[PDB]
Write a structure and sequence with these properties.
Blueprint lengths: L18 E5 L6 E5 L7 E4 L15 E6 L8 E6 L17
Antiparallel strand pairs: 1-2, 1-4, 2-3, 4-5
PDB class: rna binding protein
Keywords: cell-free protein synthesis, beta-barrel, RNA/DNA binding, greek-KEY topology, UNR protein, Structural Genomics, nppsfa, National Project on Protein Structural and Functional Analyses, RIKEN Structural Genomics/Proteomics Initiative, rsgi
Assembly: monomeric
């Protein structure tokens, strides 16, 4: 009997896709994100924004995931993006992401 309950072994977790842009609108309740290659924008609420509401300007790059929201397309679970030009360092490892 070879067929049965099997497990415990390497597991590949390759990334799928994502959508990011630039915070063009700055308000004390909600804002909008602008796209580069494409011209599609969405409405994101700061309440969902998971970052530093204290220091966010002028328009730090941000990420989001378009869902199948009924009515309009909004961005849920917004997460700020990393700095632009990366700088060398002495931290060799798997890194995040």
């Amino acid at each position: 009997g070879s067929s049965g309950s099997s497990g415990n072994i390497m597991l590949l977790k390759k990334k799928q896709a994502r959508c990011q842009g630039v915070v063009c609108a700055m308000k004390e309740a909600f804002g909008f994100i602008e796209r580069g290659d494409v011209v599609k924008e969405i409405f994101f609420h700061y309440s969902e924004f998971k970052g530093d509401l204290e220091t966010l300007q002028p328009g730090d790059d941000v990420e989001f995931t378009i869902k199948d929201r009924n009515g309009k397309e909004v961005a849920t679970d917004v997460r700020l993006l990393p700095q632009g030009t990366v700088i060398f360092e002495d931290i060799s490892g798997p890194s995040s992401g």
